[PDB]
Amino acid sequence: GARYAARNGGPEQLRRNLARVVGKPPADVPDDLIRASLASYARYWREAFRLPAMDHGRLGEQLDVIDIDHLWSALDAGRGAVLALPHSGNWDMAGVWLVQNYGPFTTVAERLKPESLYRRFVEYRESLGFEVLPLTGGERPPFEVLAERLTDNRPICLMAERDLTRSGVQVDFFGEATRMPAGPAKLAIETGAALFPVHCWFEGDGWGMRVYPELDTSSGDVTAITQALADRFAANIATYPADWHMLQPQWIADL
Ligand SMILES: CCCCCCCCCCCCCCCC(=O)O
Ligand SMILES: OC[C@H]1O[C@@H](O)[C@@H](O)[C@@H](O)[C@@H]1O
Numbered sequence: 001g002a003r004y005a006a007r008n009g010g011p012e013q014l015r016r017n018l019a020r021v022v023g024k025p026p027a028d029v030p031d032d033l034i035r036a037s038l039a040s041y042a043r044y045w046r047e048a049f050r051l052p053a054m055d056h057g058r059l060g061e062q063l064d065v066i067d068i069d070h071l072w073s074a075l076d077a078g079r080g081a082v083l084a085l086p087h088s089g090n091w092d093m094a095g096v097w098l099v100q101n102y103g104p105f106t107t108v109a110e111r112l113k114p115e116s117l118y119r120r121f122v123e124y125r126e127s128l129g130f131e132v133l134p135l136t137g138g139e140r141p142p143f144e145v146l147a148e149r150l151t152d153n154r155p156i157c158l159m160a161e162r163d164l165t166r167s168g169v170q171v172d173f174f175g176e177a178t179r180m181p182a183g184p185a186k187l188a189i190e191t192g193a194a195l196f197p198v199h200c201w202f203e204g205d206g207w208g209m210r211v212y213p214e215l216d217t218s219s220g221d222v223t224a225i226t227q228a229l230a231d232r233f234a235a236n237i238a239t240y241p242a243d244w245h246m247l248q249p250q251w252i253a254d255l
Contacts, residue, residue: 060100
């Protein structure tokens with residue numbers, strides 16, 4: 001019921017999510033923003049098609065990342081780093097930038113059906129240089145392989161603003177209840193890795209990317225950490241609202 005509806009969407013569900021971003025009823029969401037959001041949504045897929053075929057050496061030299069030194073200094077400190085970002089802009093282009101300026105990083109992939117579809121997504125992201133760990137059905141437990149990368153002073157990247165299963169962390173998101181994955185907060189606690197909020201967007205015909213100051217994981221409270229994670233994502237999504245490709249149900253109430 002809710003698990004099926006939670007993996008559907010389209011322009012109608014997009015309006016309901018952007019309604020929270022702008023703070024207006026669904027019918028009052030600007031028609032120009034919906035068009036910009038669908039246009040941004042189309043661009044990611046248009047780029048995801050040709051991204052494995054482009055000159056990644058060019059992309060790494062010419063694209064920039066705001067406050068990238070936040071990540072370098074944390075890797076210079078031997079701590080590892082957790083990069084948690086929302087589904088905004090082109091994050092596969094951001095990974096390309098990291099593969100060229102640092103090297104391969106690790107991530108997790110939901111085991112989609114059919115398997116052939118899942119196989120294609122692995123190939124796609126592996127052809128970009130990412131390490132893809134199966135969230136289920138794999139050889140090793142995903143949470144524990146990632147923890148090894150973090151204590152090994154390596155970066156992992158997690159799409160970390162949506163997880164509407166029984167195991168999601170409930171947080172406030174534009175004043176309403178949603179659920180986000182616990183992975184990012186739990187991995188910074190258990191391993192001490194630096195937890196950096198990350199945001200990607202479309203800067204004209206280019207790509208905008210930014211690393212934000214790492215969150216305080218001193219409390220060991222997954223909710224308090226994930227809530228600060230939600231606060232940062234909401235602050236960034238509000239700046240580039242059209243570049244947030246959330247056509248799926250996001251908030252608990254819409255299920
Ligand atoms: C310094 C900024 C670098 C940001 C690098 C972002 C790379 C993220 C790539 C994520 C690919 C996997 C997306 C879906 C995974 C899932 O289902 O959780
Ligand atoms: O975050 C997971 C989502 O990532 C997007 O880039 C697409 O590949 C979706 O099919 C997938 O469900």
